[PDB]
Amino acid sequence: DVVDSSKSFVMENFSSYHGTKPGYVDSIQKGIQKPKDDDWEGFYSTDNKYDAAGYSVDNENPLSGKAGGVVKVTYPGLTKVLALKVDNAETIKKELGLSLTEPLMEQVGTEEFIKRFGDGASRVVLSLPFAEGSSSVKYINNWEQAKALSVELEINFETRGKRGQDAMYEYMAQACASCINLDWDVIRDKTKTKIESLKEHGPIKNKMSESPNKTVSEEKAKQYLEEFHQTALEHPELSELKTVTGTNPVFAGANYAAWAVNVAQVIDSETADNLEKTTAALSILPGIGSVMGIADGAVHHNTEEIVAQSIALSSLMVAQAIPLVGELVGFAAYNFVESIINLFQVVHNSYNRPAYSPGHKTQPFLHDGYAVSWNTVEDSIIRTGFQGESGHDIKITAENTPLPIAGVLLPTIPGKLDVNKSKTHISVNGRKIRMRCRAIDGDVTFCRPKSPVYVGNGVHANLHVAFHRSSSEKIHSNEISSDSIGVLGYQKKVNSKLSLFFEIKSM
Amino acid sequence: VVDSSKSFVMENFSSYHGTKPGYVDSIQKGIQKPKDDDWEGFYSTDNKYDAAGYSVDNENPLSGKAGGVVKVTYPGLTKVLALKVDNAETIKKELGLSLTEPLMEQVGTEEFIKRFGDGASRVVLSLPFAEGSSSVKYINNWEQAKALSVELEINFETRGKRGQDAMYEYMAQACASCINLDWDVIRDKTKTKIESLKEHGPIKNKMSESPNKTVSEEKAKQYLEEFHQTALEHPELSELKTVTGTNPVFAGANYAAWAVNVAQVIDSETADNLEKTTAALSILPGIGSVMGIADGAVHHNTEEIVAQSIALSSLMVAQAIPLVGELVDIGFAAYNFVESIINLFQVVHNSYNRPAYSPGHKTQPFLHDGYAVSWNTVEDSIIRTGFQGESGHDIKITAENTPLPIAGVLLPTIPGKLDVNKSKTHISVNGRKIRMRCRAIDGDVTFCRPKSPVYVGNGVHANLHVAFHRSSSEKIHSNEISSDSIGVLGYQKTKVNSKLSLFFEIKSM
């Protein structure tokens, strides 16, 4: 009941990975020994060496400190991996036949437990899901049993001699072999070059002349820095940047200007002189998607050359913004570039990782003030291969004022998938609103509410879509055009489109 | 598939049925069938106000007339059999029924009644009425439904009110906070105010300044903002001037945008029919500006202020029609526009009357500063009490577009009864597990910072996992707990952080 037999197995030479902090890379290869929540006291490892690497960073400087390494640990002989459906120790003790007083992970390393659950293996290791939205597992080893592990070096980020956490993040990026895999040495080099060239430019040094170079108001400051942004963006070392930041307003000069002003306001002398404190301060500021070129679910600035341009331009602007709104030194070219680079790497790594997009599974789709999502994972799956009914629930609301829901565009397959016009309805804070559904196409039906639907702060709707299958025959790739259900918001002539993406699947 | 906790036998079981106009007097002569069929049956509900929302002219559902509600009763004993699922195929298998015959035919069978009726004369099926409602829908077999007596609860046509006021005034009885407006008063006051406004010297004056022929949106808005400012000096609009001066949602700009946007979608054919006018207006954005609805509250909740807002908006629509209108009447402003917009007020007021979880409660998202955060499941939002040991609570976090930070989270603590498990509490960003550093800031609030920068955005979500430990087995009493929310902090903007609140309830077991 608490033990999942689909993720449990006996294995010979069971291996797993362990992230190791700086200094312990060589020490640990002589054996796992505990140092000097107790139910879970134990030695931790994971089946994913890239997830292990995230545990390898200096515990005294966790945002920007050095990464240590990853080792691989192997049990000889036969090991039982005992996967648990819950991580509540007391539920595990009661559901198994265990003393509710003895710590769960003490019991796990005793011959009694190894008898009843090891299936003749020499050891039980507990297995739990690593994290929400990760398919990796976490292994929990009894500390004394773990003394049998052999330890091999997988990688030593310090051996690589790279700056910052370049080595750790470059290792993780291997997981994706669509994959941001940037050379941060190139970028750092190109970046230092651009700053120097930009500082010599005639029109740049000329617009620095116009700088009040004294404390002023924030709106004066933004206006000068918007000017500086326009001037500096004409340098031919920033010419690709000028082109790729022209259309999308997130990349505008005014957002670079707010960024530089936000940076100068939170950096004091004590902060600029320490890299951990700079990373902490910068990491809570809004607007960084302007300098990173990240908008609308995409990393647009995904070349070494264009990332260096963006980081160079922003370094200069921070250099300009400190006099006008701050008080210090130099920071702009030194610790500002180092922390910003680390922040770049955090976010790129998020975007490399497998992840459901807005409107997929239970991830909300946010658009035009609305928020919609599938209520459960199964709601987003249209099952096929049977004659009968299914129901699917979509949650809908909005952020403030009453916004309308005009209707929903639903897929139909001429004969193999049809809308149940009687069970399809929408419910607004519990008021059930029937729908009028007319096909506009062989492949699309449009359902309108029979009474006005509005959602907003404190008003939400549940849209219930009910499908009926006539044929028992499965639905084939070609048969379906759309991967999405289109909920329509207010009209602007067009409607705001809110997309809930489904998947066809058998039983 | 059968919830025994919603099933029961009852004497004189009664329910309610909403009745379209024309069938109100006729239905009282008995439930006869008319000339998914698993479900073909006679439908009723336990909540008479939910029934009232089935009573509107099918041909004109947006704006049409409302018939009534009748109460139907079985004599003797009835079995109410509450079902967990609405899939009839699944119901026939797990009840051992013919997988071919219509489920609601079988339910009217003498054999089915023996098996499941507990010695009641017949069986009625019971199902949840809708998401977000505590009502039930009852499905009656048609043959058995011949046994029902039928009494009038209310005939809306007979109250002789305009539009759908009878129905919405009836539904507002349910909440006895509560918008219970007299729409006759509001209608009369509104007609009165439109009259006086059109006579004002400065109105007729700034009205005579109108380009009075098609122009551009930016120029049309600019004049209507001017017009709006002049109109709001009239004394018949003085309360409105006061209550709309602060909230930017109620500003002249947004009355002007509302009115431009109306004139653009109303052509002579739409304008000459209330149903199509209501359809058209019902898909526009910005109605909250004239309704006085913002930030989760209905601010215009007196007859006087609603009539003032409707009157001013009627005038502005009249001014916007020459500058942007395909139509030529301007009579629309004072007739079908007012009728129609009144109906939309009623709709939205009713939504806010109805019991509903607020942002940040249960699985309702909390939408703020471009973030969306919610409890993953209803149980996550409940901190159970009265035991020693552990619990976990999942909060989902994302954002609409560019990467926004999560600076940390504020968590409640009670000296002995409730502690942050600093080991199990983490945050997971597209699968990347990030540990926290938790410090107490006060005896009742602990603050947890992530140990690697957290950013969320389109395509990047986080699961904040909060682990609580109780050392005492004593229950938490209300005095112990200051906050009813967990505060997730976003970006920093005097230095402050954006606050995202997830509201929890303390329960036993």
CSV table of C-alpha atoms in Angstrom, one decimal, chain A residues 21 37 40 51 54-55 57 59 62-63 87-90 129-134 138 165 168-169 172 250 259 262 265-266 268 279-290 292 294-298 342-343 345-347 349-351 353-358 362-364 366-367 369-371 374-375 386 388-390 395-406 420 422-423 425 427-432 434 448-454 456-462 464 489-493 495, chain B residues 36 39 50 53-54 56 58 61-62 86-89 128-133 137 167-168 171 249 258 261 265 275 278 280-289 291 293-297 343-344 346-348 350-352 354-359 363-365 367-368 370-372 374-376 387-391 394 396-407 421 423-424 426 428-433 435 449-463 465 490-493 495 497:
chain,number,residue,atom,x,y,z
A,21,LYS,CA,30.9,19.9,-1.4
A,37,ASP,CA,14.4,14.6,11.4
A,40,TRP,CA,15.2,9.9,7.9
A,51,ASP,CA,20.7,16.5,-9.9
A,54,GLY,CA,23.2,20.7,-7.5
A,55,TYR,CA,24.1,19.5,-4.0
A,57,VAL,CA,28.0,24.0,-3.7
A,59,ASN,CA,27.3,25.6,2.2
A,62,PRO,CA,25.3,28.7,-1.5
A,63,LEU,CA,24.2,31.3,-4.1
A,87,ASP,CA,7.4,10.1,2.8
A,88,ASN,CA,5.6,10.1,6.2
A,89,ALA,CA,7.7,8.0,8.6
A,90,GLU,CA,4.9,7.3,10.9
A,129,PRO,CA,10.6,10.8,-5.8
A,130,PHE,CA,13.3,13.4,-6.0
A,131,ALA,CA,11.0,16.4,-6.3
A,132,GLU,CA,7.7,17.7,-8.0
A,133,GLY,CA,8.3,17.9,-11.7
A,134,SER,CA,11.3,15.7,-11.6
A,138,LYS,CA,16.1,10.0,-4.1
A,165,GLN,CA,30.1,28.0,-11.2
A,168,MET,CA,28.8,22.9,-12.5
A,169,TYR,CA,26.3,24.6,-14.9
A,172,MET,CA,24.2,20.0,-16.0
A,250,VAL,CA,10.5,43.6,-22.9
A,259,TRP,CA,17.1,47.6,-14.4
A,262,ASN,CA,17.1,49.1,-9.6
A,265,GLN,CA,19.5,51.5,-5.4
A,266,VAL,CA,20.2,48.2,-3.6
A,268,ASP,CA,26.0,49.7,-1.1
A,279,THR,CA,24.0,37.8,-5.7
A,280,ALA,CA,21.5,37.8,-2.9
A,281,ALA,CA,20.5,41.4,-3.6
A,282,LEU,CA,20.3,41.2,-7.4
A,283,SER,CA,18.4,37.9,-7.2
A,284,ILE,CA,15.3,39.5,-5.7
A,285,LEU,CA,15.0,42.4,-8.3
A,286,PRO,CA,12.3,42.4,-11.0
A,287,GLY,CA,13.1,43.0,-14.7
A,288,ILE,CA,16.1,40.7,-15.3
A,289,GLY,CA,14.3,39.2,-18.3
A,290,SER,CA,15.2,42.3,-20.1
A,292,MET,CA,18.6,38.0,-20.4
A,294,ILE,CA,13.8,36.0,-22.0
A,295,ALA,CA,10.2,36.6,-22.8
A,296,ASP,CA,7.1,34.7,-23.8
A,297,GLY,CA,8.5,31.3,-22.7
A,298,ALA,CA,11.7,31.5,-24.8
A,342,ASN,CA,25.4,33.3,-12.2
A,343,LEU,CA,21.8,34.4,-12.4
A,345,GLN,CA,23.0,30.3,-15.5
A,346,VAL,CA,20.3,29.6,-13.0
A,347,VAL,CA,17.6,30.6,-15.4
A,349,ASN,CA,19.2,25.8,-16.5
A,350,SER,CA,15.5,26.1,-15.6
A,351,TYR,CA,14.6,26.4,-19.3
A,353,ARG,CA,14.9,21.1,-17.8
A,354,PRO,CA,11.9,19.1,-18.9
A,355,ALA,CA,8.8,21.0,-18.1
A,356,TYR,CA,5.1,21.3,-19.0
A,357,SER,CA,4.3,24.5,-20.7
A,358,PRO,CA,1.3,26.8,-19.9
A,362,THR,CA,-2.2,21.4,-14.5
A,363,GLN,CA,0.1,24.3,-15.5
A,364,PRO,CA,-2.0,27.5,-15.7
A,366,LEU,CA,-2.0,33.2,-18.0
A,367,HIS,CA,-3.1,35.7,-20.6
A,369,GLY,CA,-5.7,38.9,-17.0
A,370,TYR,CA,-7.2,35.4,-17.1
A,371,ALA,CA,-5.9,32.2,-15.5
A,374,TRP,CA,-7.0,21.8,-16.3
A,375,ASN,CA,-8.3,20.8,-12.9
A,386,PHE,CA,-14.0,2.8,-26.5
A,388,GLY,CA,-18.8,5.9,-24.3
A,389,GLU,CA,-18.5,9.2,-22.4
A,390,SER,CA,-15.7,11.2,-20.7
A,395,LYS,CA,-10.8,26.0,-14.1
A,396,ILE,CA,-11.2,29.7,-15.1
A,397,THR,CA,-10.8,33.0,-13.3
A,398,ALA,CA,-9.3,36.5,-13.7
A,399,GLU,CA,-7.1,38.8,-11.6
A,400,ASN,CA,-9.3,41.8,-10.9
A,401,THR,CA,-12.4,43.2,-12.7
A,402,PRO,CA,-15.1,41.0,-14.3
A,403,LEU,CA,-13.9,39.7,-17.6
A,404,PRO,CA,-16.2,37.7,-19.9
A,405,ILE,CA,-16.0,34.2,-21.1
A,406,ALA,CA,-17.5,34.2,-24.6
A,420,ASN,CA,-22.3,15.9,-25.5
A,422,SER,CA,-26.3,18.1,-22.7
A,423,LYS,CA,-23.5,17.4,-20.2
A,425,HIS,CA,-21.8,23.2,-19.2
A,427,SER,CA,-20.4,26.8,-13.6
A,428,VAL,CA,-19.8,30.3,-12.1
A,429,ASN,CA,-19.4,30.3,-8.4
A,430,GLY,CA,-21.7,27.3,-8.4
A,431,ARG,CA,-24.3,28.7,-10.8
A,432,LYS,CA,-24.8,26.1,-13.6
A,434,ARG,CA,-26.0,25.5,-19.9
A,448,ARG,CA,-21.6,29.6,-26.1
A,449,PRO,CA,-23.0,30.1,-22.5
A,450,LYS,CA,-26.8,30.5,-22.3
A,451,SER,CA,-26.3,33.3,-19.8
A,452,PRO,CA,-23.4,35.8,-19.4
A,453,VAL,CA,-20.2,34.4,-17.9
A,454,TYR,CA,-17.8,36.7,-16.0
A,456,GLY,CA,-12.6,38.0,-11.7
A,457,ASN,CA,-11.2,38.3,-8.2
A,458,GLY,CA,-13.5,36.1,-6.1
A,459,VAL,CA,-15.5,34.8,-9.2
A,460,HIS,CA,-14.3,31.6,-10.8
A,461,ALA,CA,-15.8,29.2,-13.3
A,462,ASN,CA,-15.6,25.5,-13.9
A,464,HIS,CA,-17.1,21.0,-17.9
A,489,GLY,CA,-12.3,35.7,-23.4
A,490,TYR,CA,-13.3,39.3,-24.1
A,491,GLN,CA,-13.4,40.7,-27.6
A,492,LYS,CA,-10.9,43.3,-28.8
A,493,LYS,CA,-12.3,41.9,-34.1
A,495,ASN,CA,-11.3,37.3,-28.7
B,36,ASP,CA,-27.7,11.0,-23.5
B,39,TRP,CA,-30.1,10.2,-18.5
B,50,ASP,CA,-30.7,27.2,-8.5
B,53,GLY,CA,-31.9,29.8,-13.2
B,54,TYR,CA,-33.5,27.1,-15.4
B,56,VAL,CA,-35.7,31.6,-18.7
B,58,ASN,CA,-35.1,29.2,-24.3
B,61,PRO,CA,-31.7,33.0,-22.7
B,62,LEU,CA,-29.5,36.1,-22.2
B,86,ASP,CA,-22.0,10.5,-13.6
B,87,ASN,CA,-20.7,7.9,-16.1
B,88,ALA,CA,-23.7,5.7,-16.7
B,89,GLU,CA,-21.6,2.8,-18.2
B,128,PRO,CA,-23.6,17.1,-7.3
B,129,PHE,CA,-25.3,20.0,-9.0
B,130,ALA,CA,-22.1,21.7,-10.1
B,131,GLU,CA,-18.5,22.5,-9.2
B,132,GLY,CA,-18.5,25.2,-6.5
B,133,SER,CA,-22.1,24.4,-5.4
B,137,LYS,CA,-29.6,17.6,-8.9
B,167,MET,CA,-35.8,36.2,-10.9
B,168,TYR,CA,-32.7,38.0,-9.6
B,171,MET,CA,-32.2,34.5,-6.0
B,249,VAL,CA,-10.5,51.4,-12.3
B,258,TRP,CA,-16.1,51.5,-22.1
B,261,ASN,CA,-16.0,50.2,-27.2
B,265,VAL,CA,-20.0,46.8,-31.5
B,275,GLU,CA,-31.1,39.8,-26.8
B,278,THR,CA,-26.9,41.8,-24.5
B,280,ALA,CA,-22.7,42.0,-27.8
B,281,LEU,CA,-22.2,43.9,-24.6
B,282,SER,CA,-21.6,40.7,-22.7
B,283,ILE,CA,-18.2,40.0,-24.4
B,284,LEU,CA,-16.7,43.4,-23.9
B,285,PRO,CA,-13.9,44.1,-21.4
B,286,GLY,CA,-14.0,46.9,-18.8
B,287,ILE,CA,-17.6,46.6,-17.5
B,288,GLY,CA,-16.2,46.7,-14.0
B,289,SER,CA,-15.5,50.4,-14.4
B,291,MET,CA,-20.2,48.4,-12.2
B,293,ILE,CA,-16.4,46.2,-9.1
B,294,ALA,CA,-12.7,45.9,-8.4
B,295,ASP,CA,-10.3,44.0,-6.1
B,296,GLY,CA,-12.9,41.3,-5.1
B,297,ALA,CA,-15.6,43.7,-4.0
B,343,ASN,CA,-29.1,42.6,-16.8
B,344,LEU,CA,-25.3,42.3,-16.8
B,346,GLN,CA,-27.6,41.5,-12.1
B,347,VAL,CA,-25.6,38.6,-13.4
B,348,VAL,CA,-22.4,39.8,-11.8
B,350,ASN,CA,-25.4,37.4,-8.2
B,351,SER,CA,-22.0,35.8,-8.8
B,352,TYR,CA,-20.6,37.9,-5.9
B,354,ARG,CA,-22.9,33.3,-4.1
B,355,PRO,CA,-20.6,31.5,-1.7
B,356,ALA,CA,-17.2,31.2,-3.3
B,357,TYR,CA,-13.6,30.7,-2.2
B,358,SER,CA,-11.5,33.8,-2.5
B,359,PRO,CA,-8.1,34.0,-4.1
B,363,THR,CA,-7.2,25.6,-4.9
B,364,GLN,CA,-8.3,29.1,-6.1
B,365,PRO,CA,-5.2,30.9,-7.4
B,367,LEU,CA,-3.0,36.4,-8.9
B,368,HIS,CA,-0.8,39.4,-8.2
B,370,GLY,CA,2.2,38.8,-12.6
B,371,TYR,CA,2.6,35.8,-10.3
B,372,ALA,CA,0.1,33.0,-10.0
B,374,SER,CA,-2.2,28.3,-5.4
B,375,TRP,CA,-2.4,25.3,-3.1
B,376,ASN,CA,-1.8,22.2,-5.1
B,387,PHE,CA,-1.2,14.9,17.0
B,388,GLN,CA,2.6,14.6,17.3
B,389,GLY,CA,4.4,14.4,13.9
B,390,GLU,CA,4.7,15.5,10.4
B,391,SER,CA,2.7,17.1,7.5
B,394,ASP,CA,2.4,21.8,-1.7
B,396,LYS,CA,2.4,25.8,-6.9
B,397,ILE,CA,4.1,29.0,-8.1
B,398,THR,CA,4.6,30.5,-11.6
B,399,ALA,CA,4.4,33.8,-13.4
B,400,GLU,CA,2.9,35.0,-16.7
B,401,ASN,CA,6.0,36.1,-18.7
B,402,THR,CA,9.6,37.2,-17.8
B,403,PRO,CA,11.5,35.6,-14.9
B,404,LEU,CA,10.3,36.9,-11.6
B,405,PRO,CA,12.1,36.0,-8.3
B,406,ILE,CA,10.8,34.2,-5.2
B,407,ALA,CA,12.7,35.8,-2.3
B,421,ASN,CA,10.7,21.1,9.6
B,423,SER,CA,15.0,19.6,6.6
B,424,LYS,CA,11.9,18.6,4.6
B,426,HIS,CA,12.3,22.9,0.0
B,428,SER,CA,11.5,22.7,-6.6
B,429,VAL,CA,12.0,24.7,-9.9
B,430,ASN,CA,11.2,22.7,-13.0
B,431,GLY,CA,12.4,19.7,-11.0
B,432,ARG,CA,15.5,21.3,-9.5
B,433,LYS,CA,15.3,20.7,-5.8
B,435,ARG,CA,16.9,23.6,-0.1
B,449,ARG,CA,15.1,31.8,1.9
B,450,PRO,CA,16.0,29.5,-0.9
B,451,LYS,CA,19.7,28.6,-1.1
B,452,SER,CA,19.8,29.0,-4.9
B,453,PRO,CA,18.0,31.8,-6.7
B,454,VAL,CA,14.4,30.9,-7.6
B,455,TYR,CA,12.9,32.5,-10.7
B,456,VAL,CA,9.5,31.6,-12.3
B,457,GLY,CA,8.0,32.7,-15.6
B,458,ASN,CA,6.3,31.4,-18.7
B,459,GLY,CA,7.6,27.8,-18.9
B,460,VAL,CA,9.2,27.8,-15.4
B,461,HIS,CA,7.2,26.8,-12.4
B,462,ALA,CA,8.0,26.0,-8.8
B,463,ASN,CA,6.6,23.7,-6.2
B,465,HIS,CA,6.9,22.2,-0.2
B,490,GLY,CA,8.3,37.9,-4.7
B,491,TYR,CA,10.5,40.6,-6.1
B,492,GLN,CA,11.5,43.6,-4.0
B,493,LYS,CA,10.3,47.1,-4.9
B,495,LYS,CA,12.0,48.5,0.5
B,497,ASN,CA,8.5,42.6,-1.3
